[PDB]
Amino acid sequence: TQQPIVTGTSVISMKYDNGVIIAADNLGSYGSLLRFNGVERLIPVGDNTVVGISGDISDMQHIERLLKDLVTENAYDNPLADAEEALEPSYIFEYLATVMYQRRSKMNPLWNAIIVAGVQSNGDQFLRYVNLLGVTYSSPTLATGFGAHMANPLLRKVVDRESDIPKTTVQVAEEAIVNAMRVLYYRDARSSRNFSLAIIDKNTGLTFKKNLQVENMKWDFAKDIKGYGTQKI
Amino acid sequence: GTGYDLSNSVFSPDGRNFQVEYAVKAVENGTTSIGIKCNDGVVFAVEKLITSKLLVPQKNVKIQVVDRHIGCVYSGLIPDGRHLVNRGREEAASFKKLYKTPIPIPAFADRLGQYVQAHTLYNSVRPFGVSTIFGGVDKNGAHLYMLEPSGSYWGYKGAATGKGRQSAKAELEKLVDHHPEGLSAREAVKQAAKIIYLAHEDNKEKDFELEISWCSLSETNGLHKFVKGDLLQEAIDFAQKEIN
């Protein structure tokens, strides 16, 4: 892929005391046209991993097929695919990251920014990032696109360091994620009011909420805005 | 003349490929494996000879899964069976990639059959040494197939191959006669355990371990799963009662 066509906007994710939360809008933009709605960009893999993909939707579907094939291959000749020998988030990440760096090095990348979020077997929270360049970085807060600019400050106000992760509750993290989604809908032209949100808790498990909407929007002050300076009516 | 049994793909004056028949003998030297088609799926069973108590029980799996809905169990040269299962997994992956839809059971059967028939076509390749009973549930329901080293494969109501293949075939004929309406998934599992236990008596010199898998539209939602735990022990007890 040399130029993205149908594109997916921002993805956001953070860590909390018992796991991770990731979220992404359900919009497939054909450039400036908001062409497709209800496009799920969060792909669950097992009961401990969610992959949030932003970018070329065709390459996103390719990565979906690749993840499904990886699950199928890990099921082969593995009587422990249900337990110790199940796909860990780190495995899925490292595989995707190797694929992305290879595609970059062949001068034909997957025009995507991927955030892998999950809980390992030992309960540790895994949150990491990869992109079309193969760059990998991990932080208590991770976001793509406009997310990385706007949601990251709000989410970092909750968890600036690793020491803030044990103190952050699931409710606080989910509220911060919803506020970041609302802010993106405010100031992102390629955002959608409809989004999806996954919560991977080492105790509760995988909670996947679809068809969510941005609520409690402030638009009343728009009635008082008149002209662009000197106009009054 | 003589020497028609020294090179693969060589037709004898009868019209036979003796190397294929020798591979069939190698299969007949293997353990007993069976497949039973029920009303909403298939059940596979196999006997694992416990050569020594040093073998880890419940490990050393013999039934292999293909895609997420196909089960395969082979009697004969286990390594050749693994080679064939790997080739079948590649075929299923290719099919799903190209046509999105999971590979149908007849398509998978024909893929394996063409692979084996190609392996019976050249003197540079040895015929396969495994008879494979496989199948599963697709959009057209349940399917149970058996494939011989000659490349010949057929769809079966019940199939069996190995040393105790004859007693298993007789018991399967009894089951087909006494159940025209069709067996249920758990009933098929119990009958497979029974038939495996009955066919072990031919080589009762060493103890054996039973291994059962099933793919049922209602009991496993169409996915190939190993019967373990309470159901496996229940089938074992049913067989132990059936023998005496």
Swiss-Prot record, chain A:
Main location: cytoplasm
One Gene Ontology biological process: proteasome assembly
Origin superkingdom: Eukaryota
Keyword line: Cytoplasm, Nucleus, Proteasome
GO cellular component terms, A-Z: cytosol; nucleus; proteasome complex; proteasome core complex, beta-subunit complex; proteasome storage granule
Pfam family, one: Proteasome
InterPro entries the record matches: Ntn_hydrolases_N, Proteasome_beta4, Proteasome_bsu_CS, Proteasome_sua/b, Proteasome_suB-type
Compartments it resides in: Cytoplasm; Nucleus
Record-linked PROSITE patterns: PROTEASOME_BETA_1, PROTEASOME_BETA_2
Remaining remarks: Present with 16900 molecules/cell in log phase SD medium.
Function description: Non-catalytic component of the proteasome which degrades poly-ubiquitinated proteins in the cytoplasm and in the nucleus. It is essential for the regulated turnover of proteins and for the removal of misfolded proteins. The proteasome is a multicatalytic proteinase complex that is characterized by its ability to cleave peptides with Arg, Phe, Tyr, Leu, and Glu adjacent to the leaving group at neutral or slightly basic pH. It has an ATP-dependent proteolytic activity. PRE3 and PRE4 are necessary for the peptidyl-glutamyl-peptide-hydrolyzing activity.
Family the UniProt entry places it in: Belongs to the peptidase T1B family.
Quaternary structure (record): The 26S proteasome consists of a 20S proteasome core and two 19S regulatory subunits. The 20S proteasome core is composed of 28 subunits that are arranged in four stacked rings, resulting in a barrel-shaped structure. The two end rings are each formed by seven alpha subunits, and the two central rings are each formed by seven beta subunits. The catalytic chamber with the active sites is on the inside of the barrel. Interacts with CIC1.
Protein name per its UniProtKB record: Proteasome subunit beta type-7
Name of the gene encoding the protein in the UniProt record: PRE4
Curated annotation (Swiss-Prot), chain B:
UniProt main location, coarse: cytoplasm
Post-translational modification: The alpha and beta forms are probably products of the same gene with different post-translational modifications.
GO cellular component, one term: proteasome core complex, alpha-subunit complex
Entry keyword annotation includes Nucleus: yes
GO molecular function: mRNA binding
Miscellaneous note of the record: Present with 12000 molecules/cell in log phase SD medium.
Protein name from the UniProt record: Probable proteasome subunit alpha type-7
Originating organism: Saccharomyces cerevisiae (strain ATCC 204508 / S288c)
Gene name for this UniProt entry: PRE10
